[PDB]
Amino acid sequence: ALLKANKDLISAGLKEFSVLLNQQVFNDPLVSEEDMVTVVEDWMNFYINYYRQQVTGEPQERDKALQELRQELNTLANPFLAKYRDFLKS
Amino acid sequence: LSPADKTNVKAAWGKVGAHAGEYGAEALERMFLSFPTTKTYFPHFDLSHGSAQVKGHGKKVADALTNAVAHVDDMPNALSALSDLHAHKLRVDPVNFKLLSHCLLVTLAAHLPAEFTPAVHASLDKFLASVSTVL
């Protein structure tokens, strides 16, 4: 528990980040396996670069939450990619 | 696309989209870095001679979305029709068409830090995934 403000925050994000992934459909044009990663990659680099404003506390623990966020997003990100790389061969 | 998804995007673009047309030049550049393969060719905008054509296209995109969005309800192909024009008559790979709108989004993120909420990104993201014809 790096704090509390950054606990309901890190959780709200992992939420909104889920609606993003779940609302995703694999219609044409289908983007190459590689390019897709870059997008999700660019999506995270978005959230973090965004919440890195909502986070509070001291720039010591402030940059700990974020580092934990990026860690967590990937938790939901990986299933998605596997889900897509599966659509490729499919 | 749900009627909720329609009220969302309608507003999502209201906040975040006033200057979308000035970020023309940028996003194209951002699409060349994030997706290096989108640059190997790219016969458009006569880039080597200046950001004139590409900055203008920026506006053409932002105006296109402003309108297509303001008409999600009644003109659902507004965008799909556009994609077709590019792919069939302007000889522009629909992959590029898609990515460039992605970068426009990422580019907006960079300029509107706190106003560009993840929610707003989602609303828009959805709308942009409305590229196939509806009947």
Ligand code: HEM
């Ligand atoms: C978010 C995606 C995009 C939107 C909404 C969009 C929208 C537009 C619009 C509204 C026009 C004017 C069409 C007309 O004459 O009626 C246009 C023109 C054009 N677009 Fe796009 N575009 C997009 C992506 C792209 C991409 C990725 C390329 C390049 C590979 C491209 C290349 C062109 C070219 C070459 C023209 C003709 C410009 C001119 O009149 O000089 N567009 N686009």
